[PDB]
Amino acid sequence: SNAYETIDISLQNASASAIGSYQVGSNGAGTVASVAGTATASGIASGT
């Protein structure tokens, strides 16, 4: 009974052929990787 006292919902934007796996996964966005899916001398390096 008060103004702006409401309950929101986050219904999906669409259940069309636009939903799926929001995911590249590796080596396929822009350019291929340098170590992943590639033969290297030193291998995977340190870091985060």
Binding site: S1, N2, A3, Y4
Partner: protein, 48 residues
């Protein structure tokens, strides 16, 4: 219609009914004063 109304109208009518009922209370005080005055006047007139 869409965004403003659903809440702005309540925001209006709240103080709207507040002021209306305040005027009603003013009138109520006026008429209670009037009834006390007419009783007093009838008593004074009878004593006169």
């Amino acid at each position: 219609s869409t965004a403003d109304g659903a809440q702005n109208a309540i925001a209006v009518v709240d103080n709207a009914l507040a002021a209306i009922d305040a005027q009603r209370a003013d009138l109520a005080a006026v008429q209670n004063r009037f009834k006390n005055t007419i009783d007093n006047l009838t008593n004074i007139s009878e004593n006169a």
